[PDB]
């Protein structure tokens, strides 16, 4: 179950990585005068970090040794040119978050780690909601952005 301790560490790292990527997206939104979209990303940034803290807290309680990895620089921001690009990368991030949680659940299942499985249950359910929501926002952005100016309306 090195594989398990490992994946559990990778999950913590994925949560903080995703928090930074959300922060990068709020920065791009802000810089380009989409304050509504920026507020939304900033709030998701804080939430991803809360998920990381929740995994750490659980690992401490269960004596899963956690060691903090570097949180890499978000990369996609240098390539974003419009809100559509940003929301697409955020959907890909969320798909990565889902995979990372499934990888861990798979390893827990193999080890018969029932406590880890019970712990992950609300995060599986949260990811379903998260993916659906981002996917749904991206569809609106992509439909609205077909008329010059109209997406500025969505920005609330």
CB nearer Fe ion, residue 12 or residue 51: 51
CB of 107 to its own copies, least distance (A): 11
User: Contact letters (x/-) for Fe ion, 80-109, by CB under 5 A?
Assistant: -----------------x------------
Neighbours of 43 (CB within 10 A): 11
Residue set of the binding site for Fe(3+): 2-3, 6, 15, 30, 35, 40, 44, 47-48, 51, 94, 97, 126, 130, 132
Token readout for 142 is: 């992509």
CB of 141 to its own copies, least distance (A): 9
Q: How far is CA 41 from CA 8, 80, 146, in A?
A: 25, 15, 23
CB nearer its own copies, residue 92 or residue 132: 132
Q: How far is CA 56 from CA 68, 98, 119, 121, in A?
A: 10, 18, 12, 16
105 binds, among Fe ion, its own copies, none (CB under 5 to 8 A by kind): its own copies
CB of 32 to its own copies, least distance (A): 8
Residue set of the binding site for Fe cation: 15, 48, 51, 94, 127
44 binds Fe ion (CB under 5 A): no
CB of 119 to Fe ion, least distance (A): 13
56 binds Fe ion (CB under 5 A): no
Give residues 18-37 in contact with Fe ion (rule: CB under 5 A): none
Rg of the chain over all Cα atoms, to the nearest angstrom: 17
51 binds Fe ion (CB under 5 A): yes
For 66, list phi and psi in degrees, rounded to 5: -110, 130
Write the DSSP assignment of 94-127 as a string of letters: HHHHHHHHHHHHHHHHHTT-HHHHHHHHHHHHHH
Looking from the CA of 46 toward its CB, the CA atoms found within 13 Å total 5
């Amino acid at each position: 179950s090195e594989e398990l301790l490992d994946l559990f560490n990778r999950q913590v790292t994925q949560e903080f990585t995703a928090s930074q990527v959300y922060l990068s997206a709020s920065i791009w939104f802000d810089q380009n005068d989409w304050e509504g979209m920026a507020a939304y990303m900033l709030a998701e940034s804080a939430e991803e970090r809360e998920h990381g803290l929740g995994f750490v807290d659980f690992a401490n309680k269960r004596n899963i040794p956690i060691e903090l990895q570097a949180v890499p620089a978000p990369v996609s921001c240098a390539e974003w040119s419009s809100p559509e690009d940003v929301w697409q990368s955020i959907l890909e991030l969320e798909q990565a978050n889902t995979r990372s949680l499934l990888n861990l659940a798979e390893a827990a299942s193999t080890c018969h780690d029932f406590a880890v499985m019970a712990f992950l249950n609300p995060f599986h359910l949260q990811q379903v909601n998260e993916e659906d929501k981002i996917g749904s926002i991206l569809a609106k952005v992509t439909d609205e952005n077909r008329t010059p100016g109209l997406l500025r309306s969505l920005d609330v």
